[PDB]
Amino acid sequence: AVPPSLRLPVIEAAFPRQLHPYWPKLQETTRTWLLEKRLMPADKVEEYADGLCYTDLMAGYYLGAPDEVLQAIADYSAWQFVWDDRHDRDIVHGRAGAWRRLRGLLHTALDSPGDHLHHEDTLVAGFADSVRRLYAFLPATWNARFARHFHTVIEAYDREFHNRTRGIVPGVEEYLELRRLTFAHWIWTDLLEPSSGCELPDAVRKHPAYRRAALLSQEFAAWYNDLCSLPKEIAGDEVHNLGISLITHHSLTLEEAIGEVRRRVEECITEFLAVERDALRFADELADGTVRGKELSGAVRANVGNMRNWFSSVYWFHHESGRYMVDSWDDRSTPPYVNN
Template identity: 30%
Template sequence: MKDPRGDRANAEATAWAVGRGLIETEATEQFAGIGFGHLAARVGRGASYGELVLLAEWMAWSFVLDDQHDLLIRSGRLDGWQPLSDAIAHHVGGRPADVPASARGNPLVSSFVELCDRILAGMPPVLRDRYRRHVPRMLRSLDEEAANRRPGHRPTVEEYVLTRRHSSQLLPMMDMVEAAQGVEVPEEVDASPALEELAWSAIDVISWGNDVFSLPKEHSCGDTNNLAVLLADRHGLTLSEAVRAVEERIRARVEDFLAASRALPRALDALGVTDPAARTAVERRVRGYEDWMIGADLWQRHDCTRYRDERFAAGLEAAYTRPDLVSVA
């Protein structure tokens, strides 16, 4: 069920992005069409309105980060990326003194610092630690995506899948939703193979589904970071055949998710997890992953204009992307 406050959260998150200098005022309408507030409303069941807006603002920031990074790749200006990536990693890692003054004033960094401090302040320690791990891994995955786009280079499908799990930027957002919902899976349970398989199957379903929606842009601009593009290249498929192959893989991963869900009670027994609170937290995580898989699909189909925009489909930069946001070091 979609939280009815999604429209309001979307408007507030858009205004926040404009106010922080992430996008220009004249691009407000197109940026709002991404519908990050609606995605937050579909996956943040039970969150307070303040938590919903914070999640929408994080999503807005992550879309800007992703698009600006893509711009740097396409324009050959990646020298400007590393100082910003390092600054973000230093801050989330609890080392704000290591953030260079030159990077600290960049809107991508300053807005991250604001969001990160607000996010961490509302998280219990176990989720705070996960979030601190997940953000730097997300940043490294963007470096991996940049490497995948070197001229003449094609990652293997297996390499791409591992990178995509993090470049989706889903893990930090899932941490935020669990914090808002009061879901605290103990660390020893979170790290178990049973829960890892559950997480990766859900994230693969969401990420590969997004690859289908984003295929027009990524194919038109030569981006190899798309499962359909890679399957077409590796197996000599047409794009239509590759999309059908992705859809078959998604169906198989849904079955993997369902099987992992059914096996969880036995896996928890084997781990010696008898605490009812821990087992309830795991059950709530399963429901949360279901919300993410269904909510992300519905958002892309009904709430988001990003993948229907003519500029996007033509492989062009979004109108809200700012060429001056990242300067070359």
């Protein structure tokens, strides 16, 4: 029973959910990892980890992934949720020095994860373990591209720190550009390739149909998170949300901003349906009779299928996850799963 303001009949009808067969083992292995890496207090892992649905999100997205690949992705994605919470708490508590240090340590650990596996900051050590694991699947050129993308993500989070401490709400286009980075669009897109077992050549992954399909998948997911997480974010003085930027800079009411964000999300869906046809036709064109053409064809088809799966996984995640259930909290500004 999705709230009417969030319900998207086209997702529910035309994007049937998928679940990776490794999901039951993934759930418990990631929860054990969060425990053993001390990424969340033991009592909060026990009360909340499963209800957060982080592994469910990844297992509905990277279909076809080798189990070991999906495990590293899920650990890394759970880490990224804990990092979002740490960033939030550093801003709320004014810990600009602790944030600047963490920011520098994540840049360094991203380039040399092996050196940071036992770092005193458990958030850095957990980061390093998952990244080292992700670096073991594909050639070093893929690792370099992952790192280049995530160094950009870290700096976008630094920009968020400064906006929120100065109480600056970005403008709408400013925000849309920043959101492609704080949502980690290009990391999810990069992770498609170890999930289908193939580093794609630049010529294939920069093909306009592949690029546009990948963009729209992520714009849908980021803006649907904005639509669904707007209440928790207003309650916690978050400023980064397309709806907040519309209410703040365009005098829209809550109702009007929500309607506009919905319309933008819906347009992502139908633009995706159009370019999906071209991206799958390109996957067909890559199968040229050769072994290599078959490899690339199958990899592009799997990645475009997972671009599609991201729509339904993100849609349902926001209605199942404890992360967004702000009406259940005694303190609406402090989620119970965050370390305060």
